[model samples]
Target: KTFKQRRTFEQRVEDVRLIREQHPTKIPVIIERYKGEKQLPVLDKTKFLVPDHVNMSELIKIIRRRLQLNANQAFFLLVNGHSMVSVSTPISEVYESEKDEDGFLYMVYASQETF
Candidate 1:
């Protein structure tokens, strides 16, 4: 004797909609370049649209590829001019806690030796 019942079509659709509404599709992040570093381009005042579930490590890889940075170069990401972000930190938390009044998370990317 089984008592399990499958959800109706309407029920399934409602569940999907609820899940989607519970989380945002993307997080907006702002990047600032260090003035001291000599670079090919200035990334200051740039905004990034990142997935809410992304981690810092994945974001770093994306930035590296976007800038075509050399493998030998090392960079660090800092929040609010302090506190280096770890590879596994969730971007949503950073945005929630560290974002500026403009509602954009601020981050700085600089060479390890630049600072």
Candidate 2:
């Protein structure tokens, strides 16, 4: 004999709600250009919409493209006021650690230094 367990309608709805509430679909990051050789299109007050699980490498590539920086151009993202986050770092971690009480991640970018 085979037994099957099914969730009730209310249970299914609750589960859906739980899943939706577990993670936000979008994350807002405030990007600030600290130091760079040249000026980018979007200087200060640039807010970007990123996926909940975006990695630092992917984010940097997108920013580079958006700024129209050359391949040799270097970029650095700093979390807080000291830690230099790596390209492999997840944006979620940075957001959680460096974001202000207002729920905005403060990211600083520097492009003058060569990596």
Candidate 3:
């Protein structure tokens, strides 16, 4: 019941489909071992195959598509700019938009994990 061996993206999707279709909850379940791992080599065993760094912007687009937003409804596309080490520092901040033009909003954000 492990995927230590190399697997194709489609193969992994089939595996998850089998699990979800059979399990009583009718949804995918995750074990805690996953929570322990950061920088997972793959997004999941399923559709994600290539190294994440190669497609960061495309991934953000996929997220945008999934959320179902209108053009005016701002999508908060957060690129990974925070590699923090201290708990005392503020995780993120929202800047007040000075309204230079209609429908123009600008902001920046950061994060700090508990150490």
Candidate 4:
């Protein structure tokens, strides 16, 4: 099941509420590979607690490094399956606009072939 479907809205919101208070300088993010994607392996992690000041360009580079991708290997990040978040905006800004009702941000990554 999708992560969001696994929990009720209240439960998810409750989780974010607590975590946010625990660490206000971070954004809670859930990163999932596109279901249709085959070229890229599933990332081992889903939850990422990101620094509030980090931008998409830096975050994507970190994700790729975590994936251990070589320079030639690549993935494209789609915000909540629609917006490809602006690279210049900090995560806090993205969270302000795109956070789910549960207060977590979702990013879907896919390879070029899917586009």
Model 2 TM = 0.63
lDDT of 3 by residue, 1-115 (tens): 3232354556656665665456423222221112223322222322222221323344335434544435654333222222223323211211111211211112121111311
On lDDT, the leading prediction is: 4
Give the clashing residue pairs of candidate 3, or none.
Answer: 91-110
lDDT of 2: 0.62
After superposition, candidate 2 runs with Cα above 4 Å error: 1-23, 35-45, 113-115
TM-score of 4: 0.91
Each candidate structure's TM-score, on Cα atoms with residue i matched to residue i, is: 0.69, 0.63, 0.24, 0.91
Question: lDDT per residue, candidate 4, 1-115, as tens digits?
Answer: 6778787889888989887889878899999888788777888878888999999989999899888888887689988668563688988998899998789999988887354
lDDT of each: 0.65, 0.62, 0.30, 0.84
Query: Lowest summed-lDDT stretch of 10 residues in model 4?
Result: 78-87
Candidate structures ordered by TM-score, highest first: 4, 1, 2, 3
Expressed as tens digits, the lDDT of each residue in 5-101 for candidate 2 is 2435465455434544764565666666664436445453365668868787888888887778897766776655455546676787866776655
> Once all C-alphas are superposed, what RMSD does model 4 give against the true structure?
1.5
**Which digits, one per residue and each the tens of the lDDT, describe model 1 over residues 52-87?**
888888888888777778888777777766764467
Report residue 84 deviation for candidate 3 (angstroms): 12
- Candidate that beats the other on TM-score, 1 or 2, i.e. the better one: 1
lDDT of 3 at 5: 38
Candidate 3 lDDT score at position 22:
61
